[PDB]
Amino acid sequence: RDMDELKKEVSMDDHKLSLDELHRKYGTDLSRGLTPARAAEILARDGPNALTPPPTTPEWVKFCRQLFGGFSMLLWIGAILCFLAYGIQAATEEEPQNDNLYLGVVLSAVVIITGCFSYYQEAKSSKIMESFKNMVPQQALVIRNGEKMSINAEEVVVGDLVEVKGGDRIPADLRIISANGCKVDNSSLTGESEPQTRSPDFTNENPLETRNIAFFSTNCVEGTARGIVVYTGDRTVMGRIATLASGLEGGQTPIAAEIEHFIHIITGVAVFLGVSFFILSLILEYTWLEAVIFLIGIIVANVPEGLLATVTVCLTLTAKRMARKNCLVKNLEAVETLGSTSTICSDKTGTLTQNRMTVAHMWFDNQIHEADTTENQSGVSFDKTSATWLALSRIAGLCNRAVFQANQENLPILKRAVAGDASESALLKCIELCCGSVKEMRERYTKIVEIPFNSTNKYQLSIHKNPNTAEPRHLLVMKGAPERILDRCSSILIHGKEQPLDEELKDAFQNAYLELGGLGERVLGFCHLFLPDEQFPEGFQFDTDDVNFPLDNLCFVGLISMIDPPRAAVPDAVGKCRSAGIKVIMVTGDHPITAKAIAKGVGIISEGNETVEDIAARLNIPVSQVNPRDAKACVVHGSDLKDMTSEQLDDILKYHTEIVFARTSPQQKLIIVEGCQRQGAIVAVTGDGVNDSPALKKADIGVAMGIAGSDVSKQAADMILLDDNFASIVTGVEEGRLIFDNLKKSIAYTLTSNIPEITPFLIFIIANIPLPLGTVTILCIDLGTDMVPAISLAYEQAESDIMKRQPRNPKTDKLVNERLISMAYGQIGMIQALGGFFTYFVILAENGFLPIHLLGLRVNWDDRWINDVEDSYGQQWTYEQRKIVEFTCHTAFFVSIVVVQWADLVICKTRRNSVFQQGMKNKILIFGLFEETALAAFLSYCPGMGVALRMYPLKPTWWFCAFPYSLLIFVYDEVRKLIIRRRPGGWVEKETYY
Amino acid sequence: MARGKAKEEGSWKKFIWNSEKKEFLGRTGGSWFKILLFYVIFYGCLAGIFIGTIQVMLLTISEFKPTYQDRVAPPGLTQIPQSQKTEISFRPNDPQSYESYVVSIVRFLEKYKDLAQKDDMIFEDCGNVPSELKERGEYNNERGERKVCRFRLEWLGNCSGLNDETYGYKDGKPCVIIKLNRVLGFKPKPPKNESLETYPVMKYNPYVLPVHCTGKRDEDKEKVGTMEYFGLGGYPGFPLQYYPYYGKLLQPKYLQPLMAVQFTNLTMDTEIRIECKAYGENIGYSEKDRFQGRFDVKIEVKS
């Protein structure tokens, strides 16, 4: 069941009109297009091809979401019962306290400050992230006035004719005038992503079912089509749908899942204590109203309100950093995932390479030939007149399909802008500069049929009419993977004369590829066949879906190789990447020779490791004789991956340090990825072409080249390097590693405080001593040390070890693990607690009550009526008189925690290095330290603080009581981290490296 | 890689499962031990530091005097009948209704019996009239256990008796007994003619610290009671010869000055609030501490 009935309601089309009819309707010539005039005219009439902006949310409403954001909402709950309990106090007593009045005030205040803070940050992300929504001007290819040009899709009007190819996004609703084996992706419309074919045929009375309508917002997977624009902008079937053509979507990142899991359990225990303490307090003769306020204070205390805001800042930070690096990231959480990468499977052509090729050598007549590679000023280094070169360059031109764009024939050949394969571009530009006009050559040999090139066939092919006299009337021409091409041939062309492909030439063809390909040049094979007349009459009906003509027994003409150098950054890119423990695997549909070469040149493979072929060739023994494990690197032809079991593929992945997968199919690019994932890794695919689509989707993170990348591949990815800068991947990986550390650091720090925030009341019962710390003071601990300092850690700069340490194991280094509970609770949380206890005993003993005396007093110290409370010196204390000291003890215990929280907030700044390497360059941390203590001075030394919150001034000696303990933390962790710097794999590390 | 790590496990039985090696969802007896020990030494030594640093502070307070007194600064006025909620309510005719008030007040006065102040080494005789501060000396172990200024049950007029087992105390019209709070090294100062009292300065400006029990505050109040102060020398307050106090270390059996107030009113069957007040220069009061230098007992002789 669907709603497709509620979509075909408002339809009405011309998928039924004949071509002549279609012509006279829109008025455009079905082959020459519309004049640029008539285009500009209709554009001002109809307005740009762009859906009109759908308002998602308003400002103030987004403010409120933030204000009630998860933790924020519970804060209101407590803040409500704080005002609520204060209302009740003015009904049970005459002029009661001011505690719960001020408590609701502060609590609520926190939600507000937190709220409007987090808002503003999250607003800043959606400012910067949206500054990129309009940086990729989706282009469209239109044939206006005979020639063809690529313009902004916004400039496409009703009427003109569009040409989509493989991986092109369909720019507006089209009626297909023409297509060779075109397949579109109707997923966005009809669910199933299976490629539906578009022919020009009218197939179904319903515009949706029919094959000759290509829709706006779908994209054509592969094949090629020319359509005519029948719906622009909001008028298209996909603009008509008032849902969400572009904006809000789905997916739930692992980092998000880790956080959400933690928050579910931390909030769990935090409410387990609250109510266990709530009933315990009740048992311990706590008043009814101050029991719920004890609970509500406990809950706030074991719940890390900062986390959210911290996360928000961290994203806002990362989104600002990627932005300055021209790296469009569709989901900010995913940058985390890009840190957790163990394995980058990269594409070769247009990714590691510049995709800017230039023809450098040809192989024909058993000889290798050079052609002027840069600043040519001439043509090649052979006679332009050679019969063979003639037959080569004819098909390099004929089987080519690339063309110069509009209004270019007036400037130099290198200076003009093209349209099609970077390979074809080079072929075009080559022969246009040294031989003739491909424009004229192609028009002389009017092309009857073709199967356009695709990443899986790895050859193009076309049958052209021949206008010569030694013309057998039809000329087949084809090009592709030189190996593949050669294997389809019977004869070879030599000095004009074709003569059978003996063994000798085959091996000269093979040294040629080794030679030429070994320079890291890209190679294409070229052959033709002169279709015999008696078998192919004049009006012959060439079929191209059942192959009416020979695909075998062709005449190999030659090889042409083009230079295609590695993109500037790529070496140090993959350098730094491996150095961070990330495994780089090349995955290419190119030839093994060409691949390995680049693999060594960029450093996927290091010259010193051998392949089994390398080893075998060294000892002059059979390759199939070498033991595969003696090889650290290997170059795996996809023709053999076809005969791999998963185990076999698994094993090559498992036991090889430097892998390269050559001549791989699109799917194979997925299998490999699928393999690398099966091992338990997190993979990154960097693509460009549309053959990268399926891997890029399967990958834990897709990364498209923002320029040379296709529509469909950029759409698959989670990252689009707009400057095509491959180095951005490192900048990304570091950033991602940093989100993870700083988010773990924050959780380490915020969790310490819990132990001391709850140990007092636990001991109050276990030793029956005066309460060292109470509700009012617990809140201060929390909202004073566990807030700003926690968020400060988000602003904390990178460590120094990140791009030098192995990628995190997703099933070990969880954002919160047992080792992190070990420290915040069992180690650093304990010490801090002892700091408070110490000062507590010091104050009482100094005020007359030696610790040993303190056992048992609870019942009667808390008792409102016994005013003969005899200390150790025998002195007699009244109720309020000893309470003054008790609550002075509270104010100190709190202040103590503040002192130890410095050291903790210092050690929780670095997880490996020392704090002298790291250095105080996080100014927001320093800021956090000062205000945190200024506040702590203030709460104790401000008048009426003991009448309003039971907080009384400290005597100078008190502050230092916690100092020994604070230092103890700094140094325990300092040496703890030092043992790890100098004992990797060592017991220290394997237990205390949270 | 060839390195074997991670958790590619497929048994939730591993919660306890061990057939392989590791057990209890933990590691092996080698590390289940080793880490247990780490904490053992850690906490063990950690507790050592708390102990240690606690010990350092201990030798910064003399076991003779508190390092701070300003929080017991002015003392408070306290009675001996355990006050339920400051209230002494009973049915005068019925013995059961006050038997609680009696046992508490009787238990305390057993520290003051004549049979308890036997020996002349521990107990010294301060005169039968209130004198000036008998200053034992300097708050040290120099002179040993200082002498205890004795106090006879007889001075508390009419609230002493001499029965058999339990003291025969006041059933018709009760006996409240007032006491001062032991502040180590304190010397009470009786008021002069400037800052006078809510009542005419009963004699003994020199050596008696006055205590006067009026009705509920001083303003418009239902004043219905018959006060009768009983004490040493027949004076309504405290004999200055008992101070200063030298601590539990130096005066283990120190008996403090007592001073009763048998309340023999003319109004049964109702509850009346009565505020006592010890006046002086060394005595302060507080609007929050209802016990600092003063007193708010509300009693009901509802028969």
Next chain:
Amino acid sequence: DVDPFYYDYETVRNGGLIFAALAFIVGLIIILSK
């Protein structure tokens, strides 16, 4: 001023408020460092 026994909280209070002022102000001065 002085007299029998007590603790001068006037200066301990004004002293700590001078300090709260330092930490507060210096705290801002770092977070706004030009």
